[PDB]
């Protein structure tokens, strides 16, 4: 942490404070003032031409200015060797994650006119010409090409940034190898744990950031779409019922699987411990004819067998819950729109867009639990590295 970034706690606190200040100044206040000064109409196109529209351009300029000011302050206040990768690289990663979320939002918005046109074409034969379908698919292809290029460059930069972090930590450890030689497992640490920690922390941060912006982007969309859904299937009319029933469904899918699966990582650890003890007794018996005796090895394999059967039986409940949720979720999106389909309040395009927003929101709620799972191994590797570094000091 102290090798790649500047002073970690202060750096992260200042980054969060400046991000909050910029969000407050833009999303409520000076953002509309800058839009009026530049003359942005605010009519965001549905095609791929929205990403160089005036609103997007002024947001890009504002983000660049804010990040540049923050970076200049942190460069002058506390210069660092890896400041360009730690500060500007993280900002670029965050911006590209936001851009990918915006591309997903644009595709979701495109989903409505396309399926409205499909329904119109299916209403009567040869009512809609095929050139309209070609134009719609061309618009989607433009958006998808933008997404492909941005995602590929994002993966490239993410991998290089992770390796720069590993390089910084490796440089720090080698600068102190003469004092860290005597610590047990130092070679394993410096070789594998550095890269594993860097990749794991990068993945957790990106997943959490993407989960946050996916909700921030697709909650207003769902609120807007809920105006065409005046009634829910059984309960009836509930104010903002679509948003409530989507958030509740996603909370069930992320908080029931976790509750029925809290003992899973506490059992995989036991299975890894008994197998490790089995291997320890085996290796102790390699250069020894008296150890790894038939009874000692039998009573050690019986333990791993019995602790594996526990995991196999406890995963049954999690499997039932997860598979049942995944099978129900296929049609639970349409279930909430059944009264609207019957009453003719939504079209085919709006129904497809709503079912897409449901999936993206569920994906964000899945990214959250995935980030927690990543944080588990992150805490493990951080404990290892912290002990290794503290034994030096």
């Amino acid at each position: 942490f102290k090798s790649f970034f500047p002073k970690p706690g202060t750096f992260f606190l200042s980054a969060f404070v400046w991000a909050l200040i910029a969000v407050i100044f833009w999303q409520a206040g000076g953002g509309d003032w800058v839009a009026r000064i530049t003359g942005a109409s605010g009519q965001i196109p549905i095609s791929a031409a929205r990403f160089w529209s005036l609103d997007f351009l002024i947001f890009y300029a504002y983000y660049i200015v804010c990040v540049g000011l923050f970076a200049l302050f942190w460069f002058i206040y506390s210069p660092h060797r890896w400041q360009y990768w730690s500060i500007l690289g993280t900002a670029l990663i965050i911006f590209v994650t936001w851009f990918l979320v915006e591309v997903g939002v644009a595709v979701n918005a495109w989903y409505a006119p396309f399926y409205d046109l499909i329904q119109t074409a299916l209403s009567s034969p040869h009512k809609v010409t095929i050139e309209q379908f070609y134009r719609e698919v061309g618009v989607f292809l433009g958006i998808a090409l933008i997404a492909v290029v941005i995602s590929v460059l994002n993966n490239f930069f993410v991998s290089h940034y992770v390796f720069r972090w590993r390089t910084a930590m490796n440089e720090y450890y080698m600068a102190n190898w003469q004092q860290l030689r005597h610590i047990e497992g130092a070679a394993q640490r410096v070789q594998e744990d550095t890269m594993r920690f860097a990749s794991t922390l990068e993945n957790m941060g990106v997943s959490f950031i993407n989960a946050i912006m996916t909700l921030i982007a697709f909650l207003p969309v769902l609120v807007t779409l809920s105006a065409h859904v005046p009634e829910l299937p059984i309960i009836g009319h509930i104010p903002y019922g679509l948003v409530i029933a989507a958030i509740v469904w996603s909370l069930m899918g992320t908080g029931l699987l976790a509750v029925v699966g809290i003992k899973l990582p506490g059992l995989e650890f036991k299975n890894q411990r008994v197998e490790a003890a089995y291997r320890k007794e085996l290796v102790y018996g390699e250069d020894d004819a008296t150890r790894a005796t038939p009874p000692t090895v039998r009573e050690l394999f019986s333990a791993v067998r019995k602790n594996y059967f526990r995991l196999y039986f406890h995963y049954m409940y999690f499997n039932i819950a997860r598979i049942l949720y995944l099978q129900v979720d296929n049609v639970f999106g349409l279930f909430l729109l059944f009264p609207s389909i019957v009453a003719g309040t939504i079209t085919l395009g709006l129904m497809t867009q709503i079912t897409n927003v449901f999936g993206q929101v569920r994906g964000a709620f899945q990214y959250l639990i995935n980030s927690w799972t990543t944080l588990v191994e992150l805490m493990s590797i951080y404990k290892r590295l912290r002990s290794f570094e503290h034994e030096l000091d």
Partner: nanobody, 114 residues
């Protein structure tokens, strides 16, 4: 429940027109009440919907903003007000409520000449 539509007639392009859908029978105080329309040569189209309390109103894309739906729960009536009437908003307007079974209003003809 016997829905009855009153109001609506001949207006020019741009104007105001109010319709009253009054129920007479089982109370509709706890039902979402809908306004549909049917243009000559097309199938019926959703226009508006109002909940039981009348606080939440839902509008179609083609009539959003220009149309306002309110409900007088005491009188068991639902009022639809059209403002800035385009000539495309000519149709037979129907009132709908599902109290156990479906109840469709008799519908009133609204003409908006250019």
């Amino acid at each position: 429940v016997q829905l009855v539509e009153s109001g609506g007639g001949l207006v020019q392009a741009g104007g105001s027109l109010r319709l009253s859908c009054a129920a007479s029978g089982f109370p509709v105080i706890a039902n979402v009440m809908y306004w549909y329309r049917q243009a000559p040569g097309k199938e019926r189209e959703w226009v508006a919907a109002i909940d039981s309390s009348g606080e939440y109103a839902y509008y179609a894309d083609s009539v959003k903003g220009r149309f306002t739906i309110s409900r007088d729960n005491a009188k068991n009536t639902v009022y639809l007000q059209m403002n800035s009437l385009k000539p495309e908003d000519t149709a037979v307007y129907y009132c709908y409520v599902k109290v156990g079974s479906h109840y469709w209003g008799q519908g009133t003809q609204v003409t908006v000449s250019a």
